[PDB]
Design a protein around this ligand. Sequence first.
Ligand SMILES: */C=C/C(=O)Nc1ccccn1
Length: 307
Amino acid sequence: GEAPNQALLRILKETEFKKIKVLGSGTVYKGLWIPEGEKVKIPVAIKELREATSPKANKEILDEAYVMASVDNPHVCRLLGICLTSTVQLIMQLMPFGCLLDYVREHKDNIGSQYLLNWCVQIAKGMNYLEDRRLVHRDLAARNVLVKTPQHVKITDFGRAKLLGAAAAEYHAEGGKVPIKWMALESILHRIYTHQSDVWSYGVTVWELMTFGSKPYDGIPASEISSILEKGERLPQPPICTIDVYMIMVKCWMIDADSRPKFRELIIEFSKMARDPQRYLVIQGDERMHLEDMDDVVDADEYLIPQ
Ligand SMILES: */C=C/C(=O)Nc1ccccn1
């Protein structure tokens, strides 16, 4: 016996929610959700499948739904329920400032050390929680973290997430479109994936944030990456980064998976640094930087149903 998964999957009527506008094209809407028979309005993102004629695509979105229903943490994405219309709709908490990669590209000039290190802690907390839940994300990247507020981010995209069995050390994949430049060496060579492969990608995610959304190994093709890593080459020290911050990124990219840090240790190291941010990141102008009815609106984070 593993522990039973008593996550609740909530089925919503299409009449419970109003699509307000498009955010993306699968097509994502900003909208509002009124839970049946409750006087509350919840800002949501409603992901509606396009063709909805593809049995493959329907297995995909429901796998996402399975994983997102089974996680409850402040630093991971919050599913509110699904709607089984012609086109299946996922309803999640609206994350109004979009993905963190776009956010740090758009706002390079306004982002101070305190925000960057707090983001590093929050993502470390999200990933430590997933580890507690024996869940390997397999696609952590700056693009797959969302911004509820500039003070508050959550890990997203559980489309590749795999739920390690009671006796299963690694997860074993076979083909697809894969993020080579974020992947542990053991993942590119032997399709091996663990919490420790997730630490490698946390390292690349941190490097994306510390370079204000630069592309890892830009101009180096996917075919070369495994060879570069075997030859011991790693991503360069970002300009803002003290050796303290960069040495943490470097340890996440050790070839011995068990030599990399644990998510619980990254939480600790980034917290120590977050208490004195200007000791650990050096940024030009750091001290200066600052980042009908709405009556019954509540954020999804204050909308709890019984457990
Ligand atoms: C997991 C939350 C979510 O996907 N919400 C979202 C998506 C895109 C933009 C804004 N919020």
